[PDB]
Design a protein around this nucleic acid. Structure first.
Lengths: 71, 71, 71, 70, 71
DNA sequence: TTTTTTTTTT
């Protein structure tokens, strides 16, 4: 992944231990991140064009899965 | 088809491959979009006046159909 | 209380006086800060790189909890 | 009013006609300034250490309340 | 209007072509100068007590409006 | 002259 802030992009992936991190940020995920969930996240934010650090992007991904899976 | 964010408008349409996209975002559609579902979505969001990129609109349409057809 | 501006770092804590100050600043919290809320706050601002006085860091944490918990 | 350039301090207060000043400077305030809003402001800038004239401090409070109430 | 350096005073105004100047100095004002922004600028600098040439005052206004409207 | 973290018709 790039250093510093950057816009979301198609082959981006969170860290292997992403679920661990999400737990540490108060989001307990039962099942792993599916290819579809990630593709949808990336599409949305790639369009938006805002820029963030890798770890902030992962925080956005966790918050998004939490809302996504409540429904 | 405008570039950038835009408010929804009456002759708006999702891409021709919309059904495959929806699948890639984790929305499996067994029926194609109807002119009535699309008019309903457009009328709602046109009034609202909120602005989004084309791809984000298409995600809103996918989510909206999922919910709508579940009922 | 720590002195001078400083970047956010992993072991940072707002003092035991934090809930008190938050109330003096118009943010009334029912329950204490969770390890997770804090971890999440730290991760975000540590990546951001910005530098602040302790009290200022505390106000940002208060504002964040207020928003966070409104959901 | 406090004189010269100065650092923010606990007992600081804007003028009684602060509301109308804020309007003159393009910040239309529906309600008056609360105790907590002021304590929050004062804490922030007291830590920061920067020094300003009283009126400038009042302009900073006006800009801040605007942002804060949105 | 006064020649040479002078302290800011309540009735001060910039030139009628102030928008064109501001563009020459790199500040493109999508909107012109409001009476309020002006009073705000005057109260600030009148308090500050510094003296400047008319054209220097006009540069301070222009830089100011740039920063003030960047929000 | 510079205080202001935030995907979801239901």
């Amino acid at each position: 992944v790039p250093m510093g802030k950057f816009a979301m992009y198609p082959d981006w992936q969170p860290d292997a231990d992403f679920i661990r991190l999400a737990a540490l940020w108060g989001v307990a995920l039962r099942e792993p991140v599916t290819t579809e969930e990630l593709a949808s996240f990336i599409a949305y934010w790639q369009a938006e064009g805002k820029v963030f650090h890798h770890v902030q992007w992962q925080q956005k991904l966790a918050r998004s899965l939490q809302i996504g899976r409540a429904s």
